[PDB]
Structure formats: structure tokens, C-alpha cells
């Protein structure tokens, strides 16, 4: 039962400064095949190396570059053997709609996608004499998906008088919060 230590958790707080992650093999009973990192579940370029003492260094660290990082070690003849390491950063918004023009009654359709771990929670707010706050869905008009990395409102039945305007959506985790806006015009 091999046994590894890792560094500890990173927080990314903006690009300057790398930051790295190790992982120290301690403990074996048997020959080290070789040893890599992998990011989200899919295999870090090469990083592919027989060294019992693992590091990852991540140069201008962004949101991009958060996630759950392993170390994995594969042995001759045993099972492989992996540690966890977690690097959070506040949300990046990625992908949205600048604008969106839409006719009385059609619907209307607004996206914000993310990148960034922990995956952030999502609000729709729409900007109101200089504040965003939060939206009525008094009418019934308004509908929400929120998927880990991506958000979508949905206004039905569009009304000229009510509905234009700009709408922001709010990316938010336990390290930070993003958002951008987008505006919405109803004719005909
Ligand atoms: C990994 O081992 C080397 C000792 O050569 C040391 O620099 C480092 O502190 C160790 N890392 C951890 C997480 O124990
Ligand atoms: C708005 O109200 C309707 C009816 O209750 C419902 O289908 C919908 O889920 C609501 N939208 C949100 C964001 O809760």
C-alpha cells in the first residue's frame, strides 16, 4: 500500500506569480513504472516521468488553470496509486450574448458560460436605475437553467413595455464572482 503526500490546496488569486504542486511518493513495496499529473480527469501534456518526488508548476495561473489536479503513479506489477490536489479560482465568464433583439410575444433566449473550479452558482439580475437586482418571475414568464459551467434565462411571451433592458448574470463561487450583461431590445 504505497502511500503520498501532497502539497496543500491553492487558491488563485490573480496571473503573476507560478504557482506549483507536488506530490512525494513516501512509501513502496514495489518498482515505480512511472509517475504523471492529470487536470479534470484527462492526462496533463507531457508530464510522464519516473520520479517519486512529482511537480506540477503552472505559469500565470488563471481560471483556466483551476481544477482537480492528480498525481498519479503507475507500478510494475500493482495498481496504480493517485493523490488529489485542488486549485480554485474565482469564475472567468467565457461566453455570452452581447445583445439580443427579439419581437413582442416571441422568446427570448440569454446564455453565460464559465470557466473555473469550484463551479460557480448563477443569478440572473437585470439593471434597474444604476443597480442590477434580482428578477420577478411574478408574470410566469421567466425561466432558468443552471448547469455547473453554464446558465440560461428564457423569457417568454416578450412585452415591449416590461422586458427591455440589460441583463447580467452573476457567476459566483466560495473564491470569487463574475459577470458581464447582456441587452435586450423588443420590437414590432
Ligand atoms: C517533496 O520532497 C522534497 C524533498 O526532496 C521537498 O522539497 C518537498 O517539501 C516535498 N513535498 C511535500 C508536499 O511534502
Ligand atoms: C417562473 O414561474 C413558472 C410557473 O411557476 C415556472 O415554470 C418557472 O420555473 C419560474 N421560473 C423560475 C426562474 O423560477
Known amino acids: 500500500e504505497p502511500r503520498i503526500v501532497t502539497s496543500e490546496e491553492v487558491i488563485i488569486r490573480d496571473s503573476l506569480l507560478p504557482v506549483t504542486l507536488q506530490c512525494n511518493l513516501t512509501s513502496s513495496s514495489?518498482?515505480?513504472m512511472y509517475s504523471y499529473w492529470t487536470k479534470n480527469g484527462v492526462e496533463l501534456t507531457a508530464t510522464r516521468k519516473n520520479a517519486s518526488n512529482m511537480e506540477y508548476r503552472i505559469?500565470?495561473?488563471?481560471a483556466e488553470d483551476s481544477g482537480e489536479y492528480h498525481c498519479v503513479y503507475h507500478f510494475?506489477?500493482?495498481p496504480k496509486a493517485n493523490a488529489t490536489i485542488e486549485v480554485k479560482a474565482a469564475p472567468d465568464i467565457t461566453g455570452?450574448?452581447?445583445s439580443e433583439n427579439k419581437n413582442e410575444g416571441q422568446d427570448a433566449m440569454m446564455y453565460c458560460k464559465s470557466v473555473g473550479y469550484p463551479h460557480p452558482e448563477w443569478m440572473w439580475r437585470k439593471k434597474e436605475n444604476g443597480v442590477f437586482e434580482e428578477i420577478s418571475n411574478s408574470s410566469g414568464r421567466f425561466f432558468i437553467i443552471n448547469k455547473e459551467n453554464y446558465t440560461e434565462l428564457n423569457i417568454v411571451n416578450l412585452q415591449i413595455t416590461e422586458d427591455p433592458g440589460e441583463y447580467e448574470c452573476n457567476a459566483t463561487n466560495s473564491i470569487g464572482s463574475a459577470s458581464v450583461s447582456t441587452v435586450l431590445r423588443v420590437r414590432v
Open 76 to 78: 510494475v506489477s500493482a
Open 59 to 62: 505559469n500565470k495561473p488563471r
Open 96 to 98: 455570452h450574448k452581447r
Open 30 to 32: 514495489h518498482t515505480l
